[PDB]
Design a protein around this ligand. Structure first.
Ligand SMILES: CNc1ncnc2c1ncn2[C@@H]1O[C@H]([C@@H]2C[C@H]2CNC(=O)c2cc(-c3ccc(F)cc3)cc(O)c2O)C[C@H]1O
Ligand SMILES: [Cl-]
Ligand SMILES: [Cl-]
Ligand SMILES: [Mg+2]
Length: 213
């Protein structure tokens, strides 16, 4: 089996069905004690929680699902009726993510779309009935944060106040995205210094709030 299958099995056998907090704890224990994996983790996760609670977004887009850790983290704090869409091009990861959300009991709040962001983002309005996004969590290939930000704006998916929250702006790093948002009058940026998941290595989140054109 794969590392991601082992993580899902561990959750199924060590967390409580329908209890998202137990699912996060199981994943964090597994990845601390057994095998590292690229989940956002508890250190950065706590900052994500604080952001979600501040904005109470009704519609969130996530780029890159992996095993569903961040999707569980965000979805568990959404208000009744609020929704998360998460895009994941790897079909095996998309399958893990669906099963993780099912186990957590969050399936009704989240739609896991199996495809590439650059193909799916242009379909959001007409196929998925999206007007604008309240929040976007970027956690996919680091060289695609900037292109996809620019594509979201082109597609009319950003509104005044849309919150972009970007993982891994230090490690592995997203230098073009950071330079761009920090230099642009269309974004108000805040940096939240933290640590790489499960490691004593500095990382950080960037919040970039869209201000319109
Ligand atoms: C471009 N559009 C895309 N659309 C949908 N899914 C996409 C998509 N680009 C891609 N996807 C999916 O996401 C998959 C890429 C690999 C993830 C993206 N994350 C990372 O690379 C990552 C890495 C580290 C890391 C690794 C090693 C170190 F020594 C230190 C840090 C930590 C993280 O927190 C990370 O998030 C591939 C694919 O499954
Ligand atoms: Cl994650
Ligand atoms: Cl952590
Ligand atoms: Mg990440």
């Amino acid at each position: 089996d794969t590392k991601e299958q082992r993580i899902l099995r561990y959750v199924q056998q060590n967390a409580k069905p329908g209890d998202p907090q137990s699912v996060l704890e199981a994943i964090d224990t597994y990845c601390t004690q057994k095998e590292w994996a690229m989940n956002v983790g508890d250190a950065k996760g706590q900052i994500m929680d604080a952001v979600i609670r501040e904005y109470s977004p009704s519609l969130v887009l996530e780029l890159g699902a992996y095993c569903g850790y961040s999707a569980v983290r965000m979805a568990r704090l959404l208000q009744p009726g609020a929704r998360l869409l998460t895009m994941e091009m790897n079909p095996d990861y998309a399958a893990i993510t669906q099963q993780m959300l099912n186990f957590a009991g969050l399936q009704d709040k989240v739609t896991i779309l199996n495809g590439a962001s650059q193909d799916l983002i242009p379909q959001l309005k007409k196929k998925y009935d999206v007007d604008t996004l309240d929040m976007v969590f970027l956690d996919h290939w680091k060289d695609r944060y900037l292109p996809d930000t620019l594509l979201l704006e082109k597609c009319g998916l950003l509104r005044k106040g849309t919150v972009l929250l970007a993982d891994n702006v230090i490690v592995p790093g997203t230098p073009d995205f950071l330079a761009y948002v920090r230099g642009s009058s269309s974004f108000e940026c805040t940096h939240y210094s933290s640590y790489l998941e499960y490691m004593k290595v500095v990382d950080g989140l960037e919040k970039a709030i869209y201000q319109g054109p």
